[PDB]
Structures are given as C-alpha cells and as structure tokens.
C-alpha cells in the first residue's frame, strides 16, 4: 500500500527521480527522492487529471497543463492549507529543495487517502506556496516544472 511515482522535468523531459507514497493513521506521506530542482520552496499539489502532457490557453503553451487544476473533490474552488477543509484536498505542504538541487524532506497530507490518489497527477511548481489565492492565485506556485502520474 505504497506507490512509486516517477517524476519528470516538464521543461527538459528528463527524469528527476521519484516520490514514494504511503498511508499511515495520520494521512498520506510523500517521501521525495528527487534531484535537479531549483533550491528553495516549491508549490506541491495533486492535480485533477492523470496526465503530464501540455495544454493550451489563449494560444500559449502550458507545460503539464493537461493535468488540470488542483484536485478538489469537494468543489471548494479555493486554494488553502493541507489542514484546512474548505479548499482543494489536493493542497500539500510545500517541497523543500536543497542548495544542491535535491528534494528529500518528506511531508504529510492529513486529508488524503492513498486509495483516492490513483489516476491523478503530482505537480511541482516553480514558485512556492503561501497557501492562499492572494496575492497570487494558487499560492503563487506559477509555472509547472515537474510532474508525475499516480499509478
């Protein structure tokens, strides 16, 4: 009852490692073993669709845009924290990337179950995540930089 998720850099198309998912009594733990990411904090969320392909919007290309918006099974239409209920269930703690571009700090999502994640996608943004739609939408994560489909 743990799954392996292969993550790919959306810009380069190359693998950046994997993320292992596990279920415990307090929620789902995401344990990253990634590399080649920019140091700092990055938005980290489950997205709705099971794809990492691009999408299009007003004539411009959206890397990993086919993955849809944030997982939001309760139709909240709001971005928030991992421990608040009236926002996307997909909202995870932000992912920390070391000066050496590695991401190994595991994080917990108390509102998710492992069973419901199958078929969705894990997204790593460029920006961080202040867990609010202000001053920028979706926690200010901005562009999608790494993505993997949960199988």
């Amino acid at each position: 009852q743990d799954l392996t998720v292969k993550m790919t850099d959306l810009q380069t198309g190359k693998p950046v490692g994997t993320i292992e998912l596990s279920q415990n009594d307090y929620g789902v733990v995401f344990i990253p073993e990634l590399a080649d990411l920019t140091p700092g904090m990055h938005g980290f969320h489950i997205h709705q669709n099971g794809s990492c392909a691009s999408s299009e919007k007003d004539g411009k290309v959206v890397l990993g845009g086919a993955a849809g918006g944030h997982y939001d099974p309760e139709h909240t239409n709001k971005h928030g924290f991992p421990w608040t209920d009236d926002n996307h269930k997909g909202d995870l703690p932000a992912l920390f990337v070391s000066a050496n571009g590695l991401a190994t700090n595991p994080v917990l999502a108390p509102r998710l179950t492992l069973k419901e994640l199958k078929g969705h996608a894990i997204m790593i943004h460029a920006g961080g995540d202040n867990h609010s739609d202000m001053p920028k939408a979706l926690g200010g994560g901005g562009a999608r930089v790494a993505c993997g489909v949960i199988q």
Copy 2:
C-alpha cells in the same frame, strides 16, 4: 485556543520573533514569524522542560540545555517522524528558513494537542532533521540556536 510563543536566539540573547500555535482537527499547527535565522532546514522539536536557560555537560556549556531532551510522554527514547508513533511526540516537521533568514512556512504535528504543550519548550536547532538517530543522534539537529517556553 492559540498561544503566542516568543522565540529567542540563544547565542545572542535577542528576540527572533514568535510562533503561533493553533489546534485543528488534524493536530497542532505551528505558524512561524521569525527572522535572523540561517537559511536552510533546521531541527524543530518540543523539548521536555519549561526553560531556555543553559545547562552543563562534562564541563562544557549547552545553550538552551536546561530545556531537557525531546518531549517523550510515551517513553520511546527514539527520534523519528511527526507521523510515526514509537518516537518522541515532540518531533515536529523541520522549519524552513529563507535566504533572507526569515521563517514563515507553517507546519503540522498530527500527534500533539495544544493542551499538552503548556510548560514545554519549542527548540530550533542549527542542523536539519532526517528524523532518525542515524547517522547522527536526534536527526542531526546538533546545537540549539533558538528557544521559547510555551505559556
């Protein structure tokens, strides 16, 4: 049912800001508003005693050593993750500090209640926290750099 914790740099004796504690259905959230910390990830745990004073050990001074060891109400005598039960209940997610020395990323501790924290101390280390006693004890947090007593 939120408390304010004033945090002090143990080396300089000066204030570094505060941490607000809150209780929700998923555990206790620590929301930092700190500054003047080294960038990177730092060990972050509740310690047993209600003091931030120094201690002594084999003739050398331990900054914030009077706060005791990690909060460990189940007598596990092991350092682990915030979502694993056979380790110190005091074990929190690591605290992220920006390049500008600020700490504002909130973290959740699903195993703690607000009521039980009164009288203990919040500790911020120098090192990080791999949530293991290997290869270094207590997640490799090492020296204590900032501390505050929960009132």
